Amino acid sequence: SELAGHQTSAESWGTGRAVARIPRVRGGGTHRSGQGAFGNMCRGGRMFAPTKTWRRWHRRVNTTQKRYAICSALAASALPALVMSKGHRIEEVPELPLVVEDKVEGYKKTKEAVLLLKKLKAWNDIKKVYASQRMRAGKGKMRNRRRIQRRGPCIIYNEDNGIIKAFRNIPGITLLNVSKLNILKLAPGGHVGRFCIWTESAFRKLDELYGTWRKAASLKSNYNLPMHKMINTDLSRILKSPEIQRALRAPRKKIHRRVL
Amino acid sequence: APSRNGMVLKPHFHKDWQRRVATWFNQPARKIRRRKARQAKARRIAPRPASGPIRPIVRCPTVRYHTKVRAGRGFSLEELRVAGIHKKVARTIGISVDPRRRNKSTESLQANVQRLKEYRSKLILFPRKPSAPKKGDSSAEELKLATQLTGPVMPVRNVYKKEKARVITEEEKNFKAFASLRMARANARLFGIRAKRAKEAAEQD
Amino acid sequence: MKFNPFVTSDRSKNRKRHFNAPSHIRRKIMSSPLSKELRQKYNVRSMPIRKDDEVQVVRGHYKGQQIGKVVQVYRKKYVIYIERVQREKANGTTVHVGIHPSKVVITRLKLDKDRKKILERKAKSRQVGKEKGK
RNA sequence: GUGGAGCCGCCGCAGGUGCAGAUCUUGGUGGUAGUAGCAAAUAUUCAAACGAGAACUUUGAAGGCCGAAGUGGAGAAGGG
RNA sequence: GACCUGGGUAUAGGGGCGAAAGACUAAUCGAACCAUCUAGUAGCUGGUUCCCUCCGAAGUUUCCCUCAGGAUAGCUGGCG
RNA sequence: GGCGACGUCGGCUACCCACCCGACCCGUCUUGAAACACGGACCAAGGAGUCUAACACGUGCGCGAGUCGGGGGCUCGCACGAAAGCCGCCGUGGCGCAAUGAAGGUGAAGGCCGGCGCGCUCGCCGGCCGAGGUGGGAUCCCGAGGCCUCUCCAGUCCGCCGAGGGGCACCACCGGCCCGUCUCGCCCGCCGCGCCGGGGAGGUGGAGCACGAGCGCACGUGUUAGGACCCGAAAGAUGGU
RNA sequence: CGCGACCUCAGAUCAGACGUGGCGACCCGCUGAAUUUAAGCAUAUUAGUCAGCGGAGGAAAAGAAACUAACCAGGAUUCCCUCAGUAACGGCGAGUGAACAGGGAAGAGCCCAGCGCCGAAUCCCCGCCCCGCGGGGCGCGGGACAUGUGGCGUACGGAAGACCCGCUCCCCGGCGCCGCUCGUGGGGGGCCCAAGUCCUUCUGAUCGAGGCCCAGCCCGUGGACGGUGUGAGGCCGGUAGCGGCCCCCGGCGCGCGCCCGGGUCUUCCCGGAGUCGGGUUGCUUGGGAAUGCAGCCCAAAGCGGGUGGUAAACUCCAUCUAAGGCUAAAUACCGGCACGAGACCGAUAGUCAACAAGUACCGUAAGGGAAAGUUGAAAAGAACUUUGAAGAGAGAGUUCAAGAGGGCGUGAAACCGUUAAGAGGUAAACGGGUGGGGUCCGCGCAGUCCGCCCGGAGGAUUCAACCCGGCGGCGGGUCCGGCCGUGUCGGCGGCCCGGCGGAUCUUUCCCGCCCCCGGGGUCGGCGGGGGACCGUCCCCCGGACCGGCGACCGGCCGCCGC
RNA sequence: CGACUCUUAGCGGUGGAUCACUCGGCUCGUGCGUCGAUGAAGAACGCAGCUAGCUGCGAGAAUUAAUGUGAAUUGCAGGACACAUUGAUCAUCGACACUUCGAACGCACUUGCGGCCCCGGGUUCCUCCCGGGGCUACGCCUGUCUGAGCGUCGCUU
Numbered sequence A: 001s002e003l004a005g006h007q008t009s010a011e012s013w014g015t016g017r018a019v020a021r022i023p024r025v026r027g028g029g030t031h032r033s034g035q036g037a038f039g040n041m042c043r044g045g046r047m048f049a050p051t052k053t054w055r056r057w058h059r060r061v062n063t064t065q066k067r068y069a070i071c072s073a074l075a076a077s078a079l080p081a082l083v084m085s086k087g088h089r090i091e092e093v094p095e096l097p098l099v100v101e102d103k104v105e106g107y108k109k110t111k112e113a114v115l116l117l118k119k120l121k122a123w124n125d126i127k128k129v130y131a132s133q134r135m136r137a138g139k140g141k142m143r144n145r146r147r148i149q150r151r152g153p154c155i156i157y158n159e160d161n162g163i164i165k166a167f168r169n170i171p172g173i174t175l176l177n178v179s180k181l182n183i184l185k186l187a188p189g190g191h192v193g194r195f196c197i198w199t200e201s202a203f204r205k206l207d208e209l210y211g212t213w214r215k216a217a218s219l220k221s222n223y224n225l226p227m228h229k230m231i232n233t234d235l236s237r238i239l240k241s242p243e244i245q246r247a248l249r250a251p252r253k254k255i256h257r258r259v260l
Numbered sequence B: 001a002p003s004r005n006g007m008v009l010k011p012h013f014h015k016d017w018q019r020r021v022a023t024w025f026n027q028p029a030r031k032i033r034r035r036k037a038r039q040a041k042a043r044r045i046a047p048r049p050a051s052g053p054i055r056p057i058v059r060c061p062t063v064r065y066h067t068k069v070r071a072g073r074g075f076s077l078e079e080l081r082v083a084g085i086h087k088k089v090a091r092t093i094g095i096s097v098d099p100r101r102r103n104k105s106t107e108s109l110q111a112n113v114q115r116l117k118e119y120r121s122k123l124i125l126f127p128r129k130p131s132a133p134k135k136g137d138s139s140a141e142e143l144k145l146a147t148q149l150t151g152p153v154m155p156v157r158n159v160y161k162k163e164k165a166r167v168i169t170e171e172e173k174n175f176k177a178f179a180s181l182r183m184a185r186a187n188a189r190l191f192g193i194r195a196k197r198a199k200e201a202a203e204q205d
Numbered sequence C: 001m002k003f004n005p006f007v008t009s010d011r012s013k014n015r016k017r018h019f020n021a022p023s024h025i026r027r028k029i030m031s032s033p034l035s036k037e038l039r040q041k042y043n044v045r046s047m048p049i050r051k052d053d054e055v056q057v058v059r060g061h062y063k064g065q066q067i068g069k070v071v072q073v074y075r076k077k078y079v080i081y082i083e084r085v086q087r088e089k090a091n092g093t094t095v096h097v098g099i100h101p102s103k104v105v106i107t108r109l110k111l112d113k114d115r116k117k118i119l120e121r122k123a124k125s126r127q128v129g130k131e132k133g134k
Numbered sequence D: 001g002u003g004g005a006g007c008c009g010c011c012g013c014a015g016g017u018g019c020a021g022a023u024c025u026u027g028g029u030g031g032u033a034g035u036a037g038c039a040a041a042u043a044u045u046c047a048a049a050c051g052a053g054a055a056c057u058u059u060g061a062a063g064g065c066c067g068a069a070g071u072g073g074a075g076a077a078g079g080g
Numbered sequence E: 001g002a003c004c005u006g007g008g009u010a011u012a013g014g015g016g017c018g019a020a021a022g023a024c025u026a027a028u029c030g031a032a033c034c035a036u037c038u039a040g041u042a043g044c045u046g047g048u049u050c051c052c053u054c055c056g057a058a059g060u061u062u063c064c065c066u067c068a069g070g071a072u073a074g075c076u077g078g079c080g
Numbered sequence F: 001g002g003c004g005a006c007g008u009c010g011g012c013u014a015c016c017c018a019c020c021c022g023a024c025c026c027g028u029c030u031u032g033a034a035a036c037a038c039g040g041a042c043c044a045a046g047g048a049g050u051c052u053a054a055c056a057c058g059u060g061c062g063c064g065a066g067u068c069g070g071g072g073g074c075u076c077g078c079a080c081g082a083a084a085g086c087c088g089c090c091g092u093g094g095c096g097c098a099a100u101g102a103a104g105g106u107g108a109a110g111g112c113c114g115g116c117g118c119g120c121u122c123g124c125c126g127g128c129c130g131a132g133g134u135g136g137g138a139u140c141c142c143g144a145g146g147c148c149u150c151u152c153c154a155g156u157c158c159g160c161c162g163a164g165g166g167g168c169a170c171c172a173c174c175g176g177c178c179c180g181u182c183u184c185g186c187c188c189g190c191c192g193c194g195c196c197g198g199g200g201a202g203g204u205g206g207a208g209c210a211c212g213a214g215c216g217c218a219c220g221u222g223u224u225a226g227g228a229c230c231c232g233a234a235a236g237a238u239g240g241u
Numbered sequence G: 001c002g003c004g005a006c007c008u009c010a011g012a013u014c015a016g017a018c019g020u021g022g023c024g025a026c027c028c029g030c031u032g033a034a035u036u037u038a039a040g041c042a043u044a045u046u047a048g049u050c051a052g053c054g055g056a057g058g059a060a061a062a063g064a065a066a067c068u069a070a071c072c073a074g075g076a077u078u079c080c081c082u083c084a085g086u087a088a089c090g091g092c093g094a095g096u097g098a099a100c101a102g103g104g105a106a107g108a109g110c111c112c113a114g115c116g117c118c119g120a121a122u123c124c125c126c127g128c129c130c131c132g133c134g135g136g137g138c139g140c141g142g143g144a145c146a147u148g149u150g151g152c153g154u155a156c157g158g159a160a161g162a163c164c165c166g167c168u169c170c171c172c173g174g175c176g177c178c179g180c181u182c183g184u185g186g187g188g189g190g191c192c193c194a195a196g197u198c199c200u201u202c203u204g205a206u207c208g209a210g211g212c213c214c215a216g217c218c219c220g221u222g223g224a225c226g227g228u229g230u231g232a233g234g235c236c237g238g239u240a241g242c243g244g245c246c247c248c249c250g251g252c253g254c255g256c257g258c259c260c261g262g263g264u265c266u267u268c269c270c271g272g273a274g275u276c277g278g279g280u281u282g283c284u285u286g287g288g289a290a291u292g293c294a295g296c297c298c299a300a301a302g303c304g305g306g307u308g309g310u311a312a313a314c315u316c317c318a319u320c321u322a323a324g325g326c327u328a329a330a331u332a333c334c335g336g337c338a339c340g341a342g343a344c345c346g347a348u349a350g351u352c353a354a355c356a357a358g359u360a361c362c363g364u365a366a367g368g369g370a371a372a373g374u375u376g377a378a379a380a381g382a383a384c385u386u387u388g389a390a391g392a393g394a395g396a397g398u399u400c401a402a403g404a405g406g407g408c409g410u411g412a413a414a415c416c417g418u419u420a421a422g423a424g425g426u427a428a429a430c431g432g433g434u435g436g437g438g439u440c441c442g443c444g445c446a447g448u449c450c451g452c453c454c455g456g457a458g459g460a461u462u463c464a465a466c467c468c469g470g471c472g473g474c475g476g477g478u479c480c481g482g483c484c485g486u487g488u489c490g491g492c493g494g495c496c497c498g499g500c501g502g503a504u505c506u507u508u509c510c511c512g513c514c515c516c517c518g519g520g521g522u523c524g525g526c527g528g529g530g531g532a533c534c535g536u537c538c539c540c541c542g543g544a545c546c547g548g549c550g551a552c553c554g555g556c557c558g559c560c561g562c
Numbered sequence H: 001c002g003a004c005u006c007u008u009a010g011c012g013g014u015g016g017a018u019c020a021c022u023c024g025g026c027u028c029g030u031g032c033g034u035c036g037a038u039g040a041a042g043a044a045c046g047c048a049g050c051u052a053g054c055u056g057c058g059a060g061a062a063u064u065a066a067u068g069u070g071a072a073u074u075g076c077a078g079g080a081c082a083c084a085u086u087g088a089u090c091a092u093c094g095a096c097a098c099u100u101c102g103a104a105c106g107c108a109c110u111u112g113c114g115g116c117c118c119c120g121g122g123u124u125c126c127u128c129c130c131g132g133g134g135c136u137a138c139g140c141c142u143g144u145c146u147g148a149g150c151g152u153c154g155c156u157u
Ligand SMILES: [Mg+2]
Pocket: A138
């Protein structure tokens, strides 16, 4: 709210005079002559606790949680259960960490870009974005965002040689550098497992950018990949293992209902 | 108005603080603004090093900070005397000059004379027309770059000594104690009093 | 995608310049496509319509197979009038219903000194673009 | 059934977050009610005319009032 | 007749003017009116917007310019 | 096991009506309101616990004796990008890792063994380990013994087990340690022998030590300063008409 | 008496210039409250803020130490993070509250009076010309300023003058022109891809479907907007170190103009007064035996003076040089001109104002101050007939629609009219329980079991049983070929044509030096480099296991469809 | 029976909620950062063929010129279509113009009264005779002209 909404003379009538004790505008003549002025009740008054522009808008996240979240978002882009359960039709696609050769980075014409996604069998996700060419529900249209759209695949590269030019016309698609990854682009909506197409030179920098567990990363000064709370993580194998069921008593599979 | 166990607080908001509020919404837009002012200046002085002149070695004053080495304001006008370059020619070749600076240690003097001869060592001037007074050939095989960054000779280099390993010798492991400090502290605070008591004893006659 | 930071994208500020345009901007915005005989011959996609060009309407209640000259160009109401398409009132006095020039095909232009130069300039600006395709 | 161009489910996010009251704010509508009322300064009547249409307009005739410190004749300020 | 009155002119807010009534100062006067400080302050009145489930009070102690208010212990709930 | 058609069968809600029974008008302060207490003629829309700073505790997450770039810088000029990523001799600094006294200032490790100075209430040297001891203490370990179709020969298993052992965290107590003070006392050292320095033994004051738990981020609750849940004065001041 | 020179002053519609007033968000100088808080109220707080007054500028103010410090010292101003809610102030209550270190952003320094030297070597105005544009410069000639002091060199970091020493001739502005420019200098105008394809829905399509094996077309162009409804291709535009057109700039190189610099030694010169400081008073400050400012009285010195945060005397030491001046950048910007955006509001909201809004209206004035968006795709805005004096109707007509008819989208509630049903002396309404009537729905109406298996009665087709061929799958195996995982080593292999790291080592390696007697001595070392060693990650055989969500072939078992 | 009343519903009124729309706000950021005596801001009055407001203007008045653009403006008429003339319209905007008041400037503010100079016509006029034009505010700076002083002198008398 722009300033005071109190740019209006108003004092109460206070005394008797059989009207409520809200402040009234002064003068006469006009319609706005004894009407109730400012207060969060009144037509033309001032809103309750007007918003200030020094609300805390921006939030901090410390760096080793931002890196935790972006190691957790690449690893879920490599599991076919997780990446299909987000929406990306990856049914016809080959080997799930899709990498391609470094020739693709020097494409400059988007006809060379469309048939790549047809030959990788990744065009069918783009055709799912064309079906999601809806328009916005609600009042967001007059705040200039009328068209909603699906996010498709993201292509993560290094050494931009035209790859940004060949793909930026294809709808719902995203490019990002393998040096500077974005959790806002890898996990749209806060949900994990976005379909990603990689490149050879991109897919080989991840071992020097986040490290393995044996060596710390070289392109980040003091970062090593986070440790794992569970080693074995499929408990239908653990609970069926001979060491456990040698120790388990017996199942008590009766019911023993209430005796009348 | 208070309650159970908490702090007793003095918030400084008893004044009209909402007209004097500063919101850093332009602080992205001023960072890209002062980057562009560095870039458009770096090519305006195009061969000259960015971040300007060479700065001197300076030890910080206090008990807290006199272990460390800091870039300074300029050279004291006696370094330029001893290194042998004129003070009105020093700032036009790229040497920051501070005429109000004293060097009351010989050790801190000669480190900046050596710093200044090492600058003039790895400096290449450009002639107006190729006449070259006190100057030689073509520009050092075209000077290997154009512009340097964040310091001519990296002003901190706050280095520390080796002092490999000694054998604990006799009278080193014997004397130099905590009692050396407590006898030294009482000799500081009783020096002026005892010298008064020497004057009283000599006037006995 | 728009990349210039000096041209808008909002509905409120494009609708304001469209309805409050000057009358020389407003002829550039009342343009019309050409026919297939005429863009194979002048190799230009579209032109601003003027007073005596002859037109077949392509959409609406009146569609196709009636070549007819235009007769009046309301720029204030973004509307051209064509010599054949008309409408009877209750009075019995027939008047022209007006249609929009993007719903309109020019099948023969009107050539003067200046319409020749504009077609020549709009054509040369295309084979320069064909020479970028090396 | 009306209506004529937008809308919703799920997982997270964010609030100018849900009304019966504040002699609340603004707008609308009742009942009272076809009610109170249209009663200060004496008074109207006949015929006619024009008009779709006359207690009130006009015109004639009668009867009255103001009664020259005027309900008459002109002005100043004010109005425009 | 210390008469009634027009226009002109003078005096202005803790000021004016008053044959004095705290009268009068633009329907406002035991301190005008306009705008701002200002959304001033109130231990004091009024109001405080959806559902279901579970638990559930106190009006007593001690101190306070304290007595229509607080602080403190008791009573409660929530988390373990 | 039986019965029933073209108007009859079944059905319920914001349908109407009838009868029996029960039933005072809500909100609100209050010991008590149906009140001869106040607000409410009716209807629609609006309408009151917000944000910001500080602090406390709870909870979730990351790292962990550390932790955090928040302020800068770097990246090609990109819509989204007022984002994201990076720095590391950019960690300066903040908070924590050490307390204590007004200050000068000082500043947290003990127990077992052997030897000798009058083993003299006082002590000194050396080794060995090394955060004391007592009482409870989840868990764990050992466990005599015992438990199955014929008796003597042996090994995994399993469950019961009196008792014993090592005892986490935490609680209570005793002892010690550091800083301030107090009483009592003797000894030791010399960048120089003094109106010097250091030590002891007892009792006490401290928000201390006794093998560290913090930091950053998010949320919830509580309190405070701000117009501060909303509305309300009689006023005071400044400058004008 | 007069004449003249000056000195102090007057007049002019004298020649030529300048100042006034507006805006005021940000900045500078003043001046200045009270609400409020303290649960009262006086100091305090609010607050040196609001209001008042005066000045600017695109920034302004500040700014090159009469500084900080107290140790190995830093080195103009402003700004940011910290210092820090800290030292300090306070009915020591409520409350208030800096600075220096340190890390950054930006960085830039200078000038005069005085002191002396130089024949006033200086400046202003007018007259004509060398040469000139868009006018100001050197020159030629008088009238002034000025010795009561213009100009040159000169500044506290020292300066000057003279010897001697070793070097050097430079710079600035104008003048055309040629070449660029870092997002690729800025301004303006005019242009640049691809479906209007076939069928179909509709008032009208921008809908629905469809495009052979090149994926119907374009795409560095799928921002947005108008378009008879939802459009990459219909049309603006958008993309593009895209083109072409005109205009305006920052700096090459011909002619002006301006031209001795440094070093050592010697001699000589050297600084701002009613100011500092003190006393007192009032305000201000965190500034406390007085931080700053001001009035008044007193009033300096020159080995002086200020400061060194507890008044005072002595002493030593540190530090700066006051009472004159200028100065870019980093910083501020709720007014102006042009913009771009949004997790914002959507006509009682958002500015008071989406509209003929600071308007209508009100007050003598100061001043107060609204309400009010939407027919339709297009007016196609209802011709004509008839009733009435007209308003108003009945027809007719336009339109997808008048059930959109000129405040006309949608059209709620309160309230009213009328119709239909029902009912009625305990005002009405209500809760529980039934009954009756009405509306409506469901089944379909004495006609609703649905699937499974079995034995039946006739009808029609073809696997299976079992084997042969077959591709695919599951499972298990010597883990065979490939595979890795953990320690244990070696070839120290690649370490010198290997990575990372190390407050490991090497004064016999290497680069300029410091210490004593041109050299010598490791004679003790400084900063920089080299390779030795430890701790980790890369290749080959050796060994241990495991064949793990790492697998392919081989033969087996039993599925499987053809 | 008929009215009156009550409750439901159908339809019509009264009313303008709701939803949908948005050439407006609001907030943030960026570039620039510019008024005036050569007459500003603001105010008054006037200007169209039919014009009240708003908006745009200034007696050249709903705009002239110039350059770009290239056939309209539009509620209705009227008139130029010519554009190998100069060309409608619109934008731009550098050339010209810009009534009265206002710092507001001859004095006043009552459209009041002047005072000098020049030019046209009347007394061929100097001496308060119609019209046109120019000048006439205050402070202040440098210079010029005039000259005040029992101010300080000099030569003279
Ligand atoms: Mg909605």
